[PDB]
Amino acid sequence: DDLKAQFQELDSKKQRNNGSKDHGDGILLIDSEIARTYLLKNDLVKARDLLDDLEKTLDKKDSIPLRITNSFYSTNSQYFKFKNDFNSFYYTSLLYLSTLEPSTSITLAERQQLAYDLSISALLGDKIYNFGELLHHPIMETIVNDSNYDWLFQLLNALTVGDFDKFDSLIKVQISKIPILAQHESFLRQKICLMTLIETVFVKNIRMLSFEDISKATHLPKDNVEHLVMRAISLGLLKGSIDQVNELVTISWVQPRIISGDQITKMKDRLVEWNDQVEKLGKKMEARGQSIWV
Amino acid sequence: SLVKLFTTNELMRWPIVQKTYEPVLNEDDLAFGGEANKHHWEDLQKRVIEHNLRVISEYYSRITLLRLNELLDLTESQTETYISDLVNQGIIYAKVNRPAKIVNFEKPKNSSQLLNEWSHNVDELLEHIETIGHLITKEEIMH
Amino acid sequence: DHNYIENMNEMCKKINAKEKLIGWYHSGPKLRASDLKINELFKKYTQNNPLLLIVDVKQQGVGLPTDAYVAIEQVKDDGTSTEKTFLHLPCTIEAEEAEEIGVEHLLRDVRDQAAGGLSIRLTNQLKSLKGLQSKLKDVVEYLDKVINKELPINHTILGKLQDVFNLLPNLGTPDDDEIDVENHDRINISNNLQKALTVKTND
CATH code, domain with C75? 3.40.140.10
Residues in contact with B23: Cβ distance below 8 Å, sequence separation at least 6, in sequence order: none
Determine contact, residues A219/A226, Cβ cutoff 8 Å: no
DSSP conformation letters of B70-107: HHHTS-HHHHHHHHHHHHHTTSS--EE-TTSSEEE---
- Residue whose C-alpha is closest to residue A41's, from A11, A82, A13: A82
Interface test with B, best of C67, C150, C164 (most B CBs within 10 A): C164
Pairing of strands A238-243, B60-64: parallel
The dihedral sign for the CA sequence A62, A66, A71, A74 = positive
Closest Cβ opposite residue B129 in set C88, C136, C182:
C136
Residues in contact with A239: Cβ distance below 8 Å, sequence separation at least 6, in sequence order: A233, A251, A252, A253
Residues of C in contact with A271 (CB under 8 A): 136, 139-140, 143, 161
Residues in contact with C86: Cβ distance below 8 Å, sequence separation at least 6, in sequence order: B138, C31, C35, C52, C69, C70, C71, C72
Interior angle at CA C150, CA C147 and CA C152, nearest 5: 110
The one-letter code for the residue type at C11 is M
The dihedral sign for the CA sequence C14, C19, C20, C26 = negative
Task: With residue A238 as reference, give the H or E element that holds it.
Answer: strand A238-243
Rounding to the nearest 10 degrees, give the CA dihedral for residues A20, A26, A28, A30.
-160
Interface contact flag, A241 B64, Cβ < 8 Å:
no
List chains adjacent to chain C, taking adjacency as at least 3 C-beta pairs closer than 8 Å: A, B
Pairing of strands B102-104, C23-26: unpaired
Interface contact flag, C86 B138, Cβ < 8 Å:
yes
Determine contact, residues C58/C29, Cβ cutoff 8 Å: yes
Residues of A in contact with B8 (CB under 8 A): 234
Classify residue B131 by its DSSP letter: H
Closest Cβ opposite residue A275 in set C75, C82, C140:
C140
- Residue A252 DSSP SS3: strand
Determine contact, residues B8/A234, Cβ cutoff 8 Å: yes
Interface contact flag, C142 B136, Cβ < 8 Å:
yes
Q: Please tell me if residue B3 touches chain C, with a CB cutoff of 8 Å.
A: no
Other CB atoms within a 10 A radius of the CB of residue C92 amount to: 8
Interface contact flag, C159 A136, Cβ < 8 Å:
no
Interface contact flag, C166 A272, Cβ < 8 Å:
no
User: Among all residues of chain A, which has the CA nearest to that of C73?
Assistant: A63
Q: What are the angstrom distances between the C-alpha of A217 and each of A188, A199, A231, A269, B108?
A: 18, 10, 17, 23, 33
User: Among all residues of chain C, which has the CA nearest to that of A238?
Assistant: C166
Q: Please tell me if residue B121 touches chain C, with a CB cutoff of 8 Å.
A: yes
Q: What are the angstrom distances between the C-alpha of C137 and each of A261, A283, B13?
A: 20, 16, 53
The one-letter code for the residue type at C155 is H
First to last CA, chain A: 81
How far apart, in whole angstroms, are the C-alpha atoms of residue C164 and residue A65?
Answer: 38
How far apart, in whole angstroms, are the C-alpha atoms of residue C25 and residue A75?
Answer: 44
Alpha helical stretches, state H, C20-117? 35-45, 97-106
The one-letter code for the residue type at B131 is T
Determine contact, residues A136/C78, Cβ cutoff 8 Å: yes
Number of domains, chain A: 1
Task: With residue A243 as reference, give the H or E element that holds it.
Answer: strand A238-243
Q: Please tell me if residue C148 touches chain A, with a CB cutoff of 8 Å.
A: no
Q: B77 to chain A, minimum CA–CA distance in Å? A: 21
Other CB atoms within a 10 A radius of the CB of residue B17 amount to: 16
User: Among all residues of chain B, which has the CA nearest to that of C85?
Assistant: B138
Residues in contact with A194: Cβ distance below 8 Å, sequence separation at least 6, in sequence order: A126, A127, A228, A232, A235, A237
How far apart, in whole angstroms, are the C-alpha atoms of residue B100 and residue A41?
Answer: 64
Other CB atoms within a 10 A radius of the CB of residue B72 amount to: 22
Residues of A in contact with B64 (CB under 8 A): 244-245
Closest Cβ opposite residue A66 in set C82, C122, C166:
C82
The dihedral sign for the CA sequence C185, C189, C190, C195 = positive
Task: With residue A250 as reference, give the H or E element that holds it.
Answer: strand A248-254
How far apart, in whole angstroms, are the C-alpha atoms of residue C67 and residue A279?
Answer: 28
Number of residues written out for chain A? 294
The one-letter code for the residue type at B51 is H
Which residues are registered as beta bridge partners of A238?
A254
Interface contact flag, C175 B132, Cβ < 8 Å:
no
Interface contact flag, C126 A285, Cβ < 8 Å:
yes
Which residues are registered as beta bridge partners of A240?
A251
For residue C97, the enclosing domain spans 1-109
Interface contact flag, B137 C167, Cβ < 8 Å:
no
For residue A7, the enclosing domain spans 1-294
Interface contact flag, C160 B128, Cβ < 8 Å:
yes
Burial of A271 (0-12, 13-18, 19+ CB in 10 A): buried
Q: Please tell me if residue C145 touches chain A, with a CB cutoff of 8 Å.
A: no
Half-sphere exposure of C98 (CA within 13 A, CB side): 0
For residue B102, the enclosing domain spans 60-108
How far apart, in whole angstroms, are the C-alpha atoms of residue B42 and residue B55?
Answer: 22
Which residues are registered as beta bridge partners of A242?
A249, B60
Q: What are the angstrom distances between the C-alpha of B42 and each of A229, A268, B32, B36, B50?
A: 31, 59, 9, 10, 14
- Residue whose C-alpha is closest to residue A11's, from A29, A28, A24: A24
Interface contact flag, C140 A278, Cβ < 8 Å:
no
List chains adjacent to chain B, taking adjacency as at least 3 C-beta pairs closer than 8 Å: A, C
How far apart, in whole angstroms, are the C-alpha atoms of residue C87 and residue B79?
Answer: 57
Q: Please tell me if residue B111 touches chain C, with a CB cutoff of 8 Å.
A: yes
The one-letter code for the residue type at B112 is S
SS (H, E, C) chain B: CHHHHHHCCCCCCHHHHHHHHCCCCCCCCCCCCCCCCHHHHCCHHHHHHHHHHHHHHHHEEEEEHHHHHHHHCCCHHHHHHHHHHHHHCCCCCCEECCCCCEEECCCCCCHHHHHHHHHHHHHHHHHHHHHHHHHHHHHHHHC
- Residue whose C-alpha is closest to residue A213's, from A169, A175, A251, A259: A251
Task: With residue A109 as reference, give the H or E element that holds it.
Answer: helix A108-123
Rg (CA), chain B: 24
- Residue C87 DSSP SS3: strand
Interface contact flag, A264 C143, Cβ < 8 Å:
yes
How far apart, in whole angstroms, are the C-alpha atoms of residue B113 and residue B76?
Answer: 35
Q: Please tell me if residue B16 touches chain C, with a CB cutoff of 8 Å.
A: no
Interface contact flag, A207 C81, Cβ < 8 Å:
no
Determine contact, residues A254/C83, Cβ cutoff 8 Å: no
How far apart, in whole angstroms, are the C-alpha atoms of residue A48 and residue A39?
Answer: 9
Interface contact flag, A231 B8, Cβ < 8 Å:
no
How far apart, in whole angstroms, are the C-alpha atoms of residue B19 and residue A47?
Answer: 39
The angstrom resolution of this structure is 7.8
Residues of C in contact with B140 (CB under 8 A): 151
